[PDB]
Amino acid sequence: MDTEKLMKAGEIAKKVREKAIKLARPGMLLLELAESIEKMIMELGGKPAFPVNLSINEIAAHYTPYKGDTTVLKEGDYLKIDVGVHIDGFIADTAVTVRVGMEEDELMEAAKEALNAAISVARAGVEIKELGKAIENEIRKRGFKPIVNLSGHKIERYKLHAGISIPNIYRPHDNYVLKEGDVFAIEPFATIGAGQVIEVPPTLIYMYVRDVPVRVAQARFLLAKIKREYGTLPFAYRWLQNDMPEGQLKLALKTLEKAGAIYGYPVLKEIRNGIVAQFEHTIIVEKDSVIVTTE
Amino acid sequence: MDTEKLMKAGEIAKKVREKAIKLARPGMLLLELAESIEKMIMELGGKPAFPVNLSINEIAAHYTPYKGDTTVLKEGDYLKIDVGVHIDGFIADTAVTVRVGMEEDELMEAAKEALNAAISVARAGVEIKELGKAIENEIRKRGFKPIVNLSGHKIERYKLHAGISIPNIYRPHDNYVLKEGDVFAIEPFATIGAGQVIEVPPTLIYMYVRDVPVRVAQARFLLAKIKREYGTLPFAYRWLQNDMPEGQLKLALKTLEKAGAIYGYPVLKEIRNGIVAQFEHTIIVEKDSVIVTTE
Ligand SMILES: [Co+2]
Ligand SMILES: [Co+2]
Ligand SMILES: [Co+2]
Ligand SMILES: [Co+2]
Numbered sequence A, B: 001m002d003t004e005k006l007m008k009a010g011e012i013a014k015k016v017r018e019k020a021i022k023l024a025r026p027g028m029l030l031l032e033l034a035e036s037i038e039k040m041i042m043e044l045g046g047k048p049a050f051p052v053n054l055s056i057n058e059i060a061a062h063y064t065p066y067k068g069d070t071t072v073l074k075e076g077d078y079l080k081i082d083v084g085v086h087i088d089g090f091i092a093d094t095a096v097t098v099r100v101g102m103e104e105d106e107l108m109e110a111a112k113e114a115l116n117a118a119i120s121v122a123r124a125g126v127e128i129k130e131l132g133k134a135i136e137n138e139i140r141k142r143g144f145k146p147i148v149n150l151s152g153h154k155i156e157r158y159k160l161h162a163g164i165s166i167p168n169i170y171r172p173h174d175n176y177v178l179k180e181g182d183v184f185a186i187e188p189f190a191t192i193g194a195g196q197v198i199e200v201p202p203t204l205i206y207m208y209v210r211d212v213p214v215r216v217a218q219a220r221f222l223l224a225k226i227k228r229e230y231g232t233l234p235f236a237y238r239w240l241q242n243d244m245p246e247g248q249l250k251l252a253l254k255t256l257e258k259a260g261a262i263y264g265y266p267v268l269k270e271i272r273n274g275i276v277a278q279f280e281h282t283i284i285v286e287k288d289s290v291i292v293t294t295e
Helices: A001-022 A030-044 A105-119 A128-141 A217-230 A246-255 B001-025 B028-042 B104-119 B130-143 B217-230 B246-259
Strands: A047-056 A059-061 A078-087 A089-098 A152-156 A182-187 A189-190 A197-202 A204-208 A260-262 A267-272 A276-279 A281-285 A291-292 B051-058 B058-060 B077-085 B090-099 B152-155 B182-186 B189-191 B197-208 B262-270 B276-278 B280-284 B290-292
Touching: A001 A030, A001 A078, A001 A089, A001 A281, A030 A047, A030 A078, A047 A089, A047 A204, A059 A078, A059 A189, A059 A276, A078 A276, A078 B090, A089 A105, A089 A182, A089 A276, A089 A281, A105 A128, A105 A182, A105 A276, A105 A281, A204 A217, A217 A246, A246 A260, B001 B028, B001 B077, B001 B090, B001 B280, B028 B051, B028 B077, B058 B077, B058 B189, B058 B276, B077 B276, B090 B104, B090 B182, B090 B276, B090 B280, B104 B130, B104 B182, B104 B189, B104 B276, B104 B280, B197 B217, B217 B246, B246 B262
Parallel strands: none
Antiparallel strands: A047 A059, A047 A078, A059 A267, A078 A089, A152 A182, A182 A281, A189 A276, A197 A267, A204 A260, A281 A291, B051 B058, B051 B077, B058 B262, B077 B090, B152 B182, B182 B280, B189 B276, B197 B262, B280 B290
């Protein structure tokens, strides 16, 4: 629909991103950080597509603070900020790696540079694999491993990950064809570890999924609120940490989870605890070139 | 449409597959082999979906003989046989690894076992990732690496690789949902190498793609032949070696290649030249279980 909305989300996400890079100074508490970003996005004119992700070093992604996290930045950390905005369901998913209180290095360069290459070739008509390979070369020609299980994704109205991915590697059969009006989030992750990530507890981000009559009353209602307040967008436990006792909240979520009403999206950590750089922009696949909502 | 056709394709491919395993005896010339299989498929009632693939050891796949290959099997080889049949476009892609003149081992077991698991969970409703994970565990718990760039694919009428894949790894965002009536080819590849494949020349298989006003004369006729007899389905170079002398043939292809008419699918070889075992069956995603065309 309104390409302007995909643009607005993109525009907000840009500004907020920029500012986050700034608040990203040593000792800065992750929790303050997130809150600021979310409310900014808010007062700026839009709701978040998903809770800001502030992932540090080996924590690949899927990490968001919660009312209680004492964690603060530390000089030399590889902080990764992945933000997403949405105007009525039109997402903008951008992200950047900041070496806390320091300047970028070869790793960070590899991810950024990679990401860039992908854009230069995206244009209606090309097969996904081309971006894939592009990304792979930049990362590997710099001696770095690209992650093989975290990757770009195609966005759709009120659907963050709509089905088609954009690997950071070259898989010879990825032959989906970038159509016109296509909206894609390109996001190469680079690492010095093995190049793969595993899920490790706790589960901070969750996803609403399906109506499933639950017996335990409270749970059911917790869900109902969920339905109506977040929708199809993934949300944070931190976002509900005050709508009921920390204790009783848990179960409700679990029961909801053990019921398949909502899916939990645990923290993603590089297998051999390798540093993880990352940059992501969102694009709209046009005929001869792509427009970057988050430029 | 006719589930019976998907069944028929499936049925032929089964028989043929079975027989190939037998013809797979030492010193057996790969070229005799392929010919047999293809003609059997033929006389059995159907056309091949793609040229039989006889891939040996570190040759992951995409290898097919050509009029000229002197290559003969050798005791101890890990021959991989990937066959595909199609009834009016309803494919059946099945495949197996045979230790030439020997009995299967841990590797081969891993890939097989892996494949099985995937089926056990396939059923309308699950997310692709579940299968992915499944595969990953069987292959890895046996200390073997799964290939990360070769993987299962969703089949559709006259479209071998229709877009959605089924990774041999767990990528947390593979959330496509197995619908009812879905046809998928699950195919785990296992290897002791690194777990990745690269393209290496030559280019034996090719695939039509789009009508391009070409300048050279014979290519143009070659184009319209490819168009009429092969179609959207991929072909082997071995299938056209009669239609014209070596030299002229090549060029008509090459022009077309450049023309953007037919894409060529080079050989796939495991990077650290590691052994590659593989098994593949095609399924139809039904409500509570899946029907395996190639059982
Ligand atoms: Co993102
Ligand atoms: Co993203
Ligand atoms: Co196959
Ligand atoms: Co296949």
